[PDB]
Amino acid sequence: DTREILEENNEMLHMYLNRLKTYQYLLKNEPIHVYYGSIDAYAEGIDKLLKTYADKMNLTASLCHYSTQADKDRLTEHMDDPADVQTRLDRKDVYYDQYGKVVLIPFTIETQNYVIKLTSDSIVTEFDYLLFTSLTSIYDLVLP
Amino acid sequence: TDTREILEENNEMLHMYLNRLKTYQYLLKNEPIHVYYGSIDAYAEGIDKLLKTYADKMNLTASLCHYSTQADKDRLTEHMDDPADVQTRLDRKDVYYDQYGKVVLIPFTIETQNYVIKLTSDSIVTEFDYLLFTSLTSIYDLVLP
Amino acid sequence: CEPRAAKPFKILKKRSTTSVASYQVSPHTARIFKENERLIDEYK
Amino acid sequence: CEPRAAKPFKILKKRSTTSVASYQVSPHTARIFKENERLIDEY
């Protein structure tokens, strides 16, 4: 039925208009707190910025270490196929859980590996990839 | 009837703004921002070049237009069926959209100086573009020392 | 998944010297939202 | 409409200290696009 598809289109447009509204509002009104001087300071500043944005959008964002095998195993525990999830991430691909609830985005600060974890009770998509990775770029551009 | 068309409109909207957002992110990732400062005119120049960098790759035109002198205002609003109305909106500092999705005019102020960010397109420009293009003006300010 | 650091310095960056007309939905997309919802509600 | 300055000072800034996995569509939106086009075809 075209009804269902239509509700899906409508939901997509509303949701990403709202999330884009939030992104733009924050770039305009929220002071960016810049942490620098080491990988861990940078990582903290990125984590806080992602959080500031996810908090106002009905989804959670986190910056997860993805350096040591211990880090990798921690991340992938709660997934159906951890070895496979890990291969994808190692290969540097975005990983989308099929049901639309989790995006995992391999991310690098200087020479340290992380994964930006995005979850949502409704839906996350490539639009969220684009918005959240844009912010990591803005963070880098705002450094001295 | 009214359903096939609306479906094409939804589909077009989702493709277009996915594409424009792909471009925006790609440029934030790979294109250096060139930051002009030292005066109101340098600042306005840098904002104009940044908007242009992005619009150039997106199938729409962006400009930063003076909106100080009546001459500036008339230049802007003579392209419109109701100039007095367009002008009153802009003067009162509100965004102006045409009914047809081809023009967005966004009052913008640098220190004491008034401008209007003009966005036009042969396909479509909407509030999404307002959001992207105003986002960029915010990134410009944040990048200043 | 919550990296914290001792940090050498703290800074605050803001968008300040400028202001912009605030958000409003376009007529174009307002029409699309209205038609969507009126059609969704018409199958149901 | 093209404001230019008489003697600007310029600063080139670049996203460098970080990098990210590159773009890939989610399955969810891939499905929506496919179903749209298959329905649009169906009139």
| Complete domains list, chain B, with CATH | 1-31 (1.20.5.460), 32-145 (3.30.70.2720)
Contacts of D32 in chain B (CB under 8 A): 14
Return the C-alpha torsion angle A83, A87, A88, A89, nearest 10.
Answer: 100
Question: CA-CA distance, B50 to D13, in Å (whole number)?
Answer: 12
Q: Which residues in chain B are closer than 8 Å to D12, comparing Cβ atoms? A: 32-35
Nearest-by-CA chain D residue for A39: D17
Residue A60: phi and psi, rounded to 5, are: -115, 140
Residue closest to A137 by CA, chosen among A97, A115, A107:
A107
Distance CA A27, CA B137 (A): 9
SS3 category, B110: strand
Picking from D3, D13, D40, the nearest residue to B48 by CB comes out as D3
Which domain range does residue D32 map to?
26-43
Does the CA dihedral D25-B21-B141-B35 come out positive or negative? Answer: positive
Q: How is chain D classified by DSSP, letter by letter?
A: -----SS-EEEEE---SEEEPPP---HHHHHHHHHHHHHHTT-
Alpha helix segments (H runs only) across B92-126: none
The four Cα atoms A59, A62, A67, A73 give a dihedral, to 10 degrees, of: -50
- Cβ-in-10-Å burial (0-12, 13-18, 19+) of A47 comes to buried
> How many Cβ atoms from other residues are within 10 Å of residue B2's Cβ?
10
Q: Which of B85, B26, B24 is nearest to B60 (CA)?
A: B24
Whether chain A lies against chain B with 3 or more Cβ pairs closer than 8 A is yes
- Residue C44: which CATH number? 1.20.5.740
For A21, nearest residue in chain B (alpha carbons): B131
d(CA C37, CA C33): 6
Q: How many CA atoms lie within 13 A of A81 on its CB side?
A: 9
For residues D31 and D13, what is the distance between their CA atoms, to the nearest angstrom? Answer: 38
Specify burial of residue B69 (Cβ count, 10 A radius: 0-12, 13-18, 19+): exposed
| Resolution attained, angstroms | 2.5
- Residue identified by tokens 């960056």 is C13
Instruction: Tell me the H-state helices in chain B.
Output: 2-30, 40-56, 70-77, 83-91, 127-143
Nearest Cα residue in chain A from B22: A130
H-helix or E-strand spanning residue A14? helix A2-29
- B6–C18 C-beta distance less than 8 A: no
b/e burial code for range C5-40 (CB count within 10 A of at least 16 → b): bebeeeeebebeebebbeeebbebbeebeebbeebe
Compute the distance between CA of residue A73 and CA of residue A83 in angstroms, rounded to an integer. 9
- D38/A contact by beta carbon, under 8 A: no
Method used experimentally: X-ray
Q: Does B7 touch chain A (CB under 8 A)?
A: yes
Q: Which long-range contacts (CB under 8 A, 24 or more apart) does A17-21 make?
A: A17/B127, A17/B128, A17/C29, A18/A57, A19/A57, A19/A127, A19/A128, A19/A131, A20/A131, A20/B21, A20/B128, A20/B131, A20/B132, A21/B131, A21/C23
Contact between C12 and B135 (Cβ < 8 Å): no
